[PDB]
Structure 1
């Protein structure tokens, strides 16, 4: 029984398991805390445990390590990676800074630690609009996600310089206007919760535009929802609100990187103390400055 083995190893290692909302149901069921990128970042600043097992993708485990440099942070598989975050390279940031030296560099937390070393502040889908609104500039450098950048431009009225030019999430790019039409036909009493990583014409059909954390916060506003994000979010919402109804917009909206994490390799992570997540001190310090500024804003 992997679940009983994991529970005993958690105790033996003085470990906490942090899980993203897109983790497999059986992984969510053994996590101590579950949340979106911003909540996982905040939760990483009050870790009393000695070991963090991060059931999520590599940039998320790195963010936890940046905020807990003297704790052991484990990722259960090094193949748990984010295709969108990998699209942004330091070269892109440097070129944009050359053109707009007075523009703050605003990096989605969906980014490498190397990239965050060049950020003035980080953001998530939950706080991107608030942060960019308060920055002392009418133009900001922003990436990697161009669909979130479109949403931020619309809501703040500021000029958004995307880095790179085509950054996007293949999972959320799957959603189309035909999925909106089918959801409206199959569930005519449901409202639509849509992630800002979806394309702009789908965003415009939303009843609410929100990160997964915002979806959880605003689900109380209606009793039936079609969920335009990675399909494991439906399980999360059904567990939190058993009295509501939730439907996937597309069952095939799956993140391969997220599903590199399994119950078995969480067990192996605790058993073998692997895979240890490390961030170079110079990169971590600079990234930490931008992430702390995000939490302060």
Structure 2
């Protein structure tokens, strides 16, 4: 009975479980808070727990550690990684920063703490449009996702410099126009939730374009949705709105890094206090300054 033992160990450790929307259904059923990365980290800043067990990928647990340095942030598996965030290196930021020294370095939250030390302001897939448009410069260095960069470039009108060149998410890259055509034929009455990390030609056929947190907010606008993101988001939406109907655009659209977290290693995470996520004091200083600047900009 892992559920019973995890709940006991969670109490004995004075811990709180934070799970991303892409986590397995069994993981979400035992989580205290569920949402996207920045929300989960921002919800922990008002909470007294000694330990944070972050059911998510590496950069998410890092962000929680930067915003909660007084807590022990545990990751159940060091293999829970984001393939897109690891594509962006500091050699890529310093390169574009040499040719555009007046362009601010805007980095997606899906990035390493080391990369955030060179960023002037972080952004999520929910506030990227307003933050970039509120910036003083017309040139913006944006990464690592080039598909989100295209969406921000199309909404703000400012020329976006994507960094790196081929930075993208392989999960949301799976969605093609044939998946859009297949959805409209299987569910003709359903609207289309499409994540901004999808390719632009898929974005332009969406009913709404929003992050997983935005999909939850704007789900009330219709009773039937086809979800173009990680498949485990469908379970999250079904638990929140049981009266509505949700369908995955692709069942094979799954994140290996997210699936590295199971109910077993969460139990072992609380038992052995592993694996601790630490961020250099140096790096957490500048990375937090970019996050707090994002929060001051909504």
Shorter-chain TM-score tier: over 0.9
Q: Which residue of 2 aligns with 1:6?
A: 6
Write the deviation string for residues 65-119 of structure 1: whole angstroms up to 9, x where unpaired: 0011121000000000000000000000001110011111000000000000000
Q: For structure 1, which runs of at least 5 residues remain unmatched after alignment?
A: none
Alpha-carbon offset, residue 37 of structure 1: 2.4
Q: For structure 2, which runs of at least 5 residues remain unmatched after alignment?
A: none
Alpha-carbon offset, residue 38 of structure 1: 2.9
Alpha-carbon offset, residue 42 of structure 1: 1.8
Write the deviation string for residues 258-297 of structure 1: whole angstroms up to 9, x where unpaired: 0000000000000000000000000010101001111221
Distance 2:254 2:138 in 1: 36
Alpha-carbon offset, residue 240 of structure 1: 0.1
Distance 2:170 2:122 in 1: 22
Tell whether the 8 Å contact from 2:42 to 2:67 is kept in structure 1 after alignment.
no
Tell whether the 8 Å contact from 1:38 to 1:126 is kept in structure 2 after alignment.
no
Distance 2:11 2:44 in 1: 19
Q: TM-score, normalised by structure 2?
A: 0.99
Distance 2:41 2:76 in 1: 18
Write the deviation string for residues 143-175 of structure 1: whole angstroms up to 9, x where unpaired: 000000000000000110111011000000000
Distance 2:239 2:70 in 1: 34
Q: Match of 1:80, SS? A: coil
Distance 1:237 1:254 in 2: 16
Distance 2:180 2:232 in 1: 19
Alpha-carbon offset, residue 122 of structure 1: 0.4
For these two proteins, the number of residue pairs brought into alignment is 297
The list of structure 1 runs, each at least 4 consecutive aligned residues, that deviate by more than 6 angstroms after superposition, is none
Distance 2:44 2:30 in 1: 18
Distance 2:140 2:114 in 1: 19
Q: Which residue of 2 aligns with 1:21?
A: 21
Q: Match of 2:18, SS? A: strand
1:164-175 equivalence runs, <5 A = 164-175=164-175
Q: Which residue of 2 aligns with 1:160?
A: 160
Q: Match of 2:130, SS? A: helix
Alpha-carbon offset, residue 226 of structure 1: 0.1
Distance 2:174 2:28 in 1: 24
Q: RMSD in angstroms over aligned alpha carbons? A: 0.6
Tell whether the 8 Å contact from 2:38 to 2:63 is kept in structure 1 after alignment.
no
Alpha-carbon offset, residue 47 of structure 1: 2.5
1:34-113 equivalence runs, <5 A = 34-113=34-113
Tell whether the 8 Å contact from 1:87 to 1:167 is kept in structure 2 after alignment.
yes
Tell whether the 8 Å contact from 1:42 to 1:295 is kept in structure 2 after alignment.
no
